Every structure is written in structure tokens, then in C-alpha cells.
A paper describes a structure:
All of these exo-β-mannosidases process their substrate using a stereochemically retaining double displacement mechanism that is characterised by the formation of a covalent glycosyl enzyme intermediate (GEI). We show that these probes covalently label exo-β-mannosidases from GH families 2, 5, and 164.
Surprisingly, the resulting electron density map showed similar diffusion of electron density and rearrangement of the active site, with the ligand observed further displaced from the expected GEI in a highly unusual 1C4-like ring conformation in molecule A (ESI Fig. 2B†). In molecule B the ligand is 4C1-like (similar to the complex with the alkyl aziridine 3) and part unreacted aziridine (at occupancies 0.4 and 0.6 respectively).
Residue numbers in the entry: 27 to 863
Write the structure that this text describes.
Amino acid sequence: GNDTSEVMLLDTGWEFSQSGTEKWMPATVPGTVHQDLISHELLPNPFYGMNEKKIQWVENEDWEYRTSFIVSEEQLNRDGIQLIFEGLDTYADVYLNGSLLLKADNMFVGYTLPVKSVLRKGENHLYIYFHSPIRQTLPQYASNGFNYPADNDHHEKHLSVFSRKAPYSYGWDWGIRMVTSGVWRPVTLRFYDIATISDYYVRQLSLTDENARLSNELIVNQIVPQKIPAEVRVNVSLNGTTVTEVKQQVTLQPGINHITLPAEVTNPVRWMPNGWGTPTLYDFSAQIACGDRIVAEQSHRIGLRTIRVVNEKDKDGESFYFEVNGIPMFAKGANYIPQDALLPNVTTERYQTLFRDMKEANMNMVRIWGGGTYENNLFYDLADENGILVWQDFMFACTPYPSDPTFLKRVEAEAVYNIRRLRNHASLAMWCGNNEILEALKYWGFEKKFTPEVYQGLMHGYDKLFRELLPSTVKEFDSDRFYVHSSPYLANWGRPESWGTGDSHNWGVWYGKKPFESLDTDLPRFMSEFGFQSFPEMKTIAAFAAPEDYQIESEVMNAHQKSSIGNSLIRTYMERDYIIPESFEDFVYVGLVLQGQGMRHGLEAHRRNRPYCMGTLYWQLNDSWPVVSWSSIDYYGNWKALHYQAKRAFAPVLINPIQQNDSLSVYLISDRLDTMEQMTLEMKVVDFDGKTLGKKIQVHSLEVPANTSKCVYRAKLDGWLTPEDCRRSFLKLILKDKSGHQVAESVHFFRKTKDLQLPPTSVSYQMKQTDGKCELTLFSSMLAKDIFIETPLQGARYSDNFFDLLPGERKKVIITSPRIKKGEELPVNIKHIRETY
Ligand SMILES: *[C@H]1[C@H](N)[C@H](CO)[C@@H](O)[C@H](O)[C@@H]1O
Ligand SMILES: [Br-]
Ligand SMILES: [Br-]
Ligand SMILES: [Br-]
Ligand SMILES: [Br-]
Ligand SMILES: [Br-]
Ligand SMILES: [Br-]
Ligand SMILES: [Cl-]
Ligand SMILES: [Cl-]
Ligand SMILES: [Cl-]
Ligand SMILES: [Cl-]
Ligand SMILES: [Cl-]
Ligand SMILES: [Cl-]
Ligand code: NA
Ligand code: NA
């Protein structure tokens, strides 16, 4: 960083051409073939209506990129010059001034190339030829004798498995097929003296409250022929002030040098996850000094913490949980997918907003699921500074893969590159070999699809990749981080004997058609996947569809559904709990309410059942395009009802009323580090007009210990509420400390929404609108159920939404958007259940 090197970004002056046309046009780099075409209206909007079919032709053509740049005489006399490609998608021939520098074959590898002997004083010409990844792999497929069973690869021929390229680019059961190419990450040229730091690893040797012991491991590449005396320095600082400083004398030899400097931090300030404290980061800087001058420098942000994954046999089967700084931590978060069909269109602002969405929803963990990418350095920096643990899959999902020597050598290159790239992040907690490949080999009926000899080949192939190569590479390069070969590693949703062993993917809800209530009984040791779909709200549907298409199974809505079951299954689930509205608009509103309430029920069952269950990661956080899917946040950044419900279900203190077998239990759930003493629970039945039925019920002298779920109240329904009252009232619950200050509250309904006697009502609101802001006060004299405050403004944020407005209780809501202007009244439309029939 702060050294005598000069860096030139090659981010301007690029042109592209469809190969064999000789027509050139301006391009943006980093970027994609598809975005470059869109920018010159050579493709329609890939996301609108039926346009998916209309853009498939791009994957059959080859594509060429070129730029030129100036090098001075002074630059050419530096000791060394490197050209760095952080990403090429995928089969790319790189030519500089007549030299073939590189034949790239892995989207997930960065390439560092020496170019000083090939550079010229004046103009320099860089050309890149991108072979179609389809045409490049058709002969490979022809030679194979069988088709890999990759059902998410939306083509007769399943060519995805032969290419180290983002699996979802070929299609997915929530995804558009956009098999793109190009310079997907930045290109840089570094001019320097003596040497570069190829790698800086801060290895934590031990950590106690009294001391942290580190080993600073440096790989230094020396480009000059002489022996060079040098001083290696490491500076450890906190908030700009030096904590400790160490140095070592060396003489650097030509080529690779290994340097190790120990360092200690007495009374260390620990990194803590979101909800448990501050995600404190130290600045570790390494310098190579030759005389006056600092020839190379590299820094990392470093969090001092311990992370142990506990996976041991016990009385219930096999445990699966995270211990952070010595304390077992119930996991709360979601599975993350790519934010766009076109990865470089995802901006810094969009990454910062997604981490804001996770932190505000009380999350402490994200799984980077194995059909996407190894994410960019910014994703992992934001995880570090927001206290969110990362579960990292390798990029293999839902099919067996090849295991021939050439293919395994490509995989080894990506594994070593991305382990060294990511191993200094505080957030990084564990590596996972793949998503569901063992499950697929055991249970998806491959015995019947292939010969005995091919099935046998697939099974031996699984072990070579997932039980040998990947675990050895983690042992060698990240030896204190946990690795598991697959998620889920043994449990099957169809086999209850197996649920006590490791993590679960519960396909029972959605694919199995089970009701949401099944989640109270079908418990795992750790839920790493479960979910339910929704249509996104109307302002997103209008981005891909017209009013002619507003039907659950129109041609266009079916084109924005990629699951087998499809859109009618949502109708099937809705009927069990809600009256089905006639309006499409009203159906969509109720679908959002449905997904939120059903999933929140599962999240609550998982926390309630700790310590048998030690975490829950729902499917899925986010969307790559305008689509019907399992997401809690649509493509445009709009929170669905699920996201507000995840935030509530993940609250550090939670009152959880649960009704089973005509009785009510109330559990108090805490992920706090401190115990709470002398607490009062208070409850009160209130009818849909605001009249108390009976007296208040009070439970005193309650203890809520750190990191526990405990029952503190049970009562039969017969003898308390009339069946008529269960249709016409709700329970208010509140938790207060010794002094009577409120620390939590909850609302309970005794019957399904469709069996409620909801009074017709209207929600009135006053509005005060300034620049960037609108403050609403809401009022109804009768209960309004599950209200949705709807506005046309894309990405508008709400203090709250998708909540019950209680009878004669005024409610303040704040709406923020940089697009909100004083004197330009924001349109507001307030929906509620009773209005839909
Ligand atoms: C789980 C997800 N629910 C889908 C199938 O139900 C599919 O994306 C994949 O199997 C995921 O792991
Ligand atoms: Br060089
Ligand atoms: Br180099
Ligand atoms: Br050495
Ligand atoms: Br990047
Ligand atoms: Br293993
Ligand atoms: Br019941
Ligand atoms: Cl020196
Ligand atoms: Cl937490
Ligand atoms: Cl076969
Ligand atoms: Cl219909
Ligand atoms: Cl309820
Ligand atoms: Cl009404
Ligand atoms: Na990079
Ligand atoms: Na919990």
C-alpha cells in the first residue's frame, strides 16, 4: 500500500467485438458481454416478460476485448512490472505486444504475470479472446459417453460440470440462464523496486484474556539478481495508535523468500459477533525496508477471537454448533446467493445495504452457498466490521462432478488461491465441500439412470474431490478452521431416524407439502436450509410484467417461476390458512403475509428447542433478478414480510407463545451474555374493539438466564376462552424488569386467520414529508390484521411494516429514501386482511 510502487488501473479505453464481424464498440471493464450489448441496445432487457429465450444466442458466439496504454521511459526502468487479472470468465487467451501471456481456464483464480521484458516505451496493446464456454466444452461432452445429472443446468447438454465457472450462470430453480463472459474483476499494472509481498498471513497461535500470540508469515518475491540487505517490520495498531512493533534483519535472495516474525498483544480486545459486543479490528501492516525506502507494504484488518465448530457423538446422535470466544452461540441468519445475473453490475452501495439488511434483522451468520462465487474482498470486509460469521461452501452444488487429473489440478489452483485470499478475515468460520452432492448420490435415484460401472465411477470420484483434495488443502493452508465434506453430511428430510445426526436441509416444507406446524415436531441439531416461496410486491412485478399477465399461472408468471411445484403450490398453502382473494394484487399481498408467518413459526421452533437445536439459516436471503422465490428481500432491495418477521424472531430477547393440543405454553428465549432477574410476564385478552376480557394475568419472580429457552407458563384453553372468544380476541404479552421497564412484547391469535371474525375497518393516517423522509401516524379503532404500507418508490426503507395495528393504539412509522422530496406527496396505500374479501 504505502510503499514506492506505482499502480495504473486499466479500467478505461476498452472495446469489444463479436468474433468474425470486425465491428468494434466501446465497453465497460470490469463488466460482461451481456451488459456491453445492452448498453448499445443489441439485447432487450433480459429480465422483462418472455425475453429469456431472446438472449440465449450470446452463449454460442466468441468475444474479443482490446485496450491500449502508455508506458514512460522512467516506468520501464523500474526493477519489476506485474499485470494482475483478479478474474477472467472463463476460457481467455491474453495477448500483450505479440506475446501469449496466459491461457485462462478458471473464473475463480487471480493471475499475477511478469511483463517488464514484453512492455514497450509508448503505446502498448492488450487483446483478450474469450472462447464460448459452450463451444469449448461440446467436444468434451461428446467424449464423455453420458450426461451428468445437473437438473439446474437449463439445457439438453449439462456442460456446467466441465467448467470452473459460477454454476447458477447456466440456470437455477430461482435463476435466469445468462451464460456470460468477460473481465469480471479489476485489471492492474504495478511498477516497483526490489520485491513484492506475494502473501501476508497473520496466524493466531493462542488467545487468552491475558495474551494473544501471533506469527506474521510473509512470502516475498525478489525480482533483481543481487543479494539485497533489508529490514522486515510489522506494526500492530488500534484506531491509529501503535500497540506493538517488531523487526528482523534479512538479506533477500533472488526468487521466493519465507520470513516469519512473532508478535504478542497483552490484554487483547476480542472480536465479538453481532448481539454479543463490538467487532473490534486491529490494523496489521508489514513493510520491506531497503535503506531509506519502503519497497513493499501489505496490511490486513485482524480480529482476535476463537471459533470452534463442535461436531461430536452425544446422547441425541451428533452435535453441530459454533463456540465463539469459549461460549456456545445459537446461529441466526440465511443462505446468500449472487445479487445479480451480471456480477460486476453489483455496486459497493448494494453490498453495504445487504449487510445493513442482515445486521438490522439481528443476524450473526451467513452461508455463501456453493452454486454462486467465492465473494469479493468487500463482502468479507463488511462481514468483519458487522460481526457476521461466514460459512464458505466451495463452488460445487447438486450434481456429481468429474474427478480426472486435469480437472482436479484446476480445482487445487482455485482452492489454494481462495483459501489464501480469505484466511485473514475475522468473519470466516468454516469451509464446506459442496451443497447436497452426497444426498444426491445416495437418494435421488442415480442407481437407475446410469450403468453400474458409471455409478461406481461417480462414487470413487466424490471421495477423490471432497474427502481427499479439498480437506488436505484446508489442513495445509487453514489448519485451525473446520472443514465438512457436504451440507447436509448425513441427515435426510425423508428419514426421521437421521434428524439427530449433524445439520438438516428440511425439504418437508415446500417440496414435501408439509404444513408449517410440522416444524414444531420435525427438529434438527442445526437447520442449514429450509424455506417457502412468495411473489414479490406489485412494484417489482410491474418491472417484468403487464396487467394482461396478472394471473398465478399466466405464461409470464410461469416464466418467472423456476421450481417444479410452481405458483399453484402457493395457492394450495394459502387456502389452508387464509381466504383466497379474487384480485391478483390482493393475492400477492396475502402471499407475502403467508411466507412471513409460516417461516417465523419455524425460526421460533428452532430457537425454542435449544440446546437440542443450535442454529437456523433459512433459504434464502436475496434474489439475482425479478422472480418468484424463497427470498426475504426482492431483487430491488425491498423487504418482504419475511424479513420483518426474521428480525422479530431473532430478537436477543423473545416471548414465544406456542399453542398445541388446545393448550398455550409461553417460553422466554435469550441470546444475551447476562442473566435477567426478578422479571414479570404480564398477559391480557383484548377483543377486536379494544375491550379487556377478564383481568390481567401476572407471573412474577421470573429468571431469564443467559443463552437459554425456558417454559414459564401453561394453561388449557377449555375453561378460559369460549370458542366464540377465540375467533374475536387476541393475547397481548409483555416482559418487564424489577422496576417495571418493558424489555419485550408479543401478540397471539388463537385460530387461523381465515377463521377470525375480522370487523370491516379503514386505517386513517396523518403524513409529515420532508427531504429524504416521510413520518406516518396510523389509527384504526378496530384491529387491522397484518397491514402492508405500500408505496411506488423502489428500495424505500420502513422503521416497520407487515404488523397488526391494534384497536385504538396510534402507531408511528418512518419511511426513508434519498428520492423523497419536500412538497411531492409520496403515494401511500394501506392494505389489511379484512379488505381482501
Ligand atoms: C435447496 C432449495 N430449497 C432448492 C430445492 O428445494 C434448491 O435450490 C437446492 O436443492 C437448495 O440446496
Ligand atoms: Br518483471
Ligand atoms: Br510476477
Ligand atoms: Br527463504
Ligand atoms: Br472485486
Ligand atoms: Br472429510
Ligand atoms: Br390448538
Ligand atoms: Cl536495510
Ligand atoms: Cl448472537
Ligand atoms: Cl451410463
Ligand atoms: Cl385463475
Ligand atoms: Cl399467532
Ligand atoms: Cl374492510
Ligand atoms: Na480480488
Ligand atoms: Na436462541
